[PDB]
Amino acid sequence: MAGNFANARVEKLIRQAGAQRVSADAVDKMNEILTDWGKNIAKYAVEIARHSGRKTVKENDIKLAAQK
Amino acid sequence: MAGNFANARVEKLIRQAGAQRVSADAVDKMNEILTDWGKNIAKYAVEIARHSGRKTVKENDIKLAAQK
Amino acid sequence: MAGNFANARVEKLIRQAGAQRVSADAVDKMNEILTDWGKNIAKYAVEIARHSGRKTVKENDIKLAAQK
Amino acid sequence: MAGNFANARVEKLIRQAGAQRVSADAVDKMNEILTDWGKNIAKYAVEIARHSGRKTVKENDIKLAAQK
Amino acid sequence: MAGNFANARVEKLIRQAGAQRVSADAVDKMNEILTDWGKNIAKYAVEIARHSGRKTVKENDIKLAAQK
Amino acid sequence: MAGNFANARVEKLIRQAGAQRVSADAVDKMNEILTDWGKNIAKYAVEIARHSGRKTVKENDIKLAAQK
Amino acid sequence: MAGNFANARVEKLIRQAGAQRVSADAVDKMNEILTDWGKNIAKYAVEIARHSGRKTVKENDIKLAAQK
Amino acid sequence: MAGNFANARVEKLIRQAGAQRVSADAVDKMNEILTDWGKNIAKYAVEIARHSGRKTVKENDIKLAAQK
DNA sequence: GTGCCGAGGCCGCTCAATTGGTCGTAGACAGCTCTAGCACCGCTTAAACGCACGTACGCGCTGTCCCCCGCGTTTTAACCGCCAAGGGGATTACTCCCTAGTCTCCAGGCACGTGTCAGA
DNA sequence: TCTGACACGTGCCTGGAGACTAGGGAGTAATCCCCTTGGCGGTTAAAACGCGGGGGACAGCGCGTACGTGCGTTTAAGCGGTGCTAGAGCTGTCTACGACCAATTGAGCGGCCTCGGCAC
């Protein structure tokens, strides 16, 4: 519920940033920080989609929500 | 390289934010925006870890890099 | 509290940047903008130092906080 | 020219941000980082003042240059 | 809304930079990167024009906003 | 050669940024500033594509070139 | 330390340039110039490698960065 | 080769710049690049010194030859 | 308010990667002992702040004319489709040639004793 | 011409740069076959320029803000030195990540329907 993404994908991201070693707690904390920040953008994008008069969230509503 | 996470996971997050329908272009854009922002936090967490004299990125380095 | 630096020092900076004349209201606004931006870098450098396990803010912590 | 502000004023700023102890090399580095960022805002505020048709830098200008 | 310029125009620019072949995905990403950077210069040029006391954005307002 | 894009499209961009009136000399200067900054990104994306050993410029080459 | 090469080798280079005497100040300035020009090439060498797919920055990567 | 930096110290420079693996050919080319730029600076630095009516090469001379 | 077609929802398979277990051993934390370098208090001088007078610049008022907005016709191109091919990609073998542990050596690096060598 | 501050050369103590000899990670040619770009042709759409009306931007004089100079008072910042707190370096214990391996969860990809999104 706190980490929505797969741990192996969040770990690959921290290793491509240059991390020589990555603690499983750091993978769990990065998963939580990506999930929380993603839920915030998606919640605001859903309100932009409905203000625009549509049920579907589309690329422009994610792009505009991220620029807030 | 552009979208690090699995699309069905990023889609589940947008549907739990309340979306009634989700365009595949919104799933791809959210995957890119999460990847870019996650790489920014991870790259700075790695410089904090190496400054604390450690090779391992740990929970505290991710927490501190996100509050920047 | 709003302008931490001496006004004659902030005025000397705006005059060395090329200003032919400097209004007292521009010296006070620059003093506030330097105080606010300096407090933001120092507050994160103190958290960068306490994470490293030290009480003393050193050149490396200010350098790392300014690159955030 | 390297550090424009008074060292005891830059140190008081780092101590009000919460630092328990401050290294003299951190006071000099903060003085350099404030001087460099202050010269960037003053140099662009002087070009805004001159574009507006005036010799005097005024509060308005420093406000517009800082938001760049 | 994401790509303001004509695709055949963005593509001619990439082919004049020396590209032997250009992916349609690269034309649409270049169009988005030019549109976002152009909107940022124009938004700040509009604030420079209004600070100068005018409604009309002129050559000097675009030139000053780009040097920021 | 100095302005690659259509003037009516560069003008639409400055009007969508909030401009109440836009001078023809500002449309031409914005067209030149977008063309020059666009040629710089495209020249570096062509070199990234050729280092990677491919004649085709692709989305990842434009994305990596713009982040420089 | 600002020098990547050993001070004695920066001094030996100044002597090969015809200087009958080289000040300790000239040795430190030479070390800094070689450090700056070195890092500015190494960064581009790392980019050439990562772009070609290879993890090893080979001889081509150095020659290509020195002209880039 | 005929380099000024020590071979394993030109190598340490490339690795310290971020190299994951360094080809022993690039160690040699880096040493050549540092040697060539070194001589090209020393010759001009020696001329500027002899012009100023001094014999001991000083920081000022190298600082000016590098800024040219 | 009405018609049409984008393009997402829903479904079923399977294979590809994720999560879980257990082993090895690299690394991170705690503890001792010493040195680095900071906080405190003190002196005295630098230079900051605040007048008071002067006068340069700025902000208005307003009246010319610059030059942009609206409206419009023309035709120059950008978008699209269909058809052809070249290219880039994934899957493979073989052979580079760097990482690695182990090693000897050249010459890097700091101190001691002298005259250099830059100035009014 | 007239001339006195403080850095430099040569030796000793010391180490990290140079160099294997070998293992095997990853670099880079082969090839086969989908992806997807180039290419040619048609056509409407939307970009350019042209005229007319008039909104607002640029210049000129007046008046009055308010910044510059010069000066005095004094409150700070700076530099020394004391003296003691905390950070660094070495070392040892032990914790927890990298690694290989299993196996089954669940993500991706068509293929078929029809809800709602886009223009008139």
Short mmCIF file of C-alpha atoms (C1' of nucleotides) in Angstrom, two decimals, chain H residues 5-9, chain J residues 8 16-18 27:
data_model
loop_
_atom_site.label_atom_id
_atom_site.label_comp_id
_atom_site.label_asym_id
_atom_site.label_seq_id
_atom_site.Cartn_x
_atom_site.Cartn_y
_atom_site.Cartn_z
CA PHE H 5 51.28 13.22 -15.71
CA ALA H 6 52.31 9.73 -14.42
CA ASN H 7 50.49 6.98 -16.42
CA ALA H 8 48.59 5.51 -13.43
CA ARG H 9 47.71 9.08 -12.26
"C1'" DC J 8 65.27 28.14 -3.10
"C1'" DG J 16 53.21 4.31 -4.69
"C1'" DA J 17 53.97 4.08 -9.59
"C1'" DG J 18 55.18 0.61 -12.95
"C1'" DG J 27 33.56 -6.44 -26.62
#
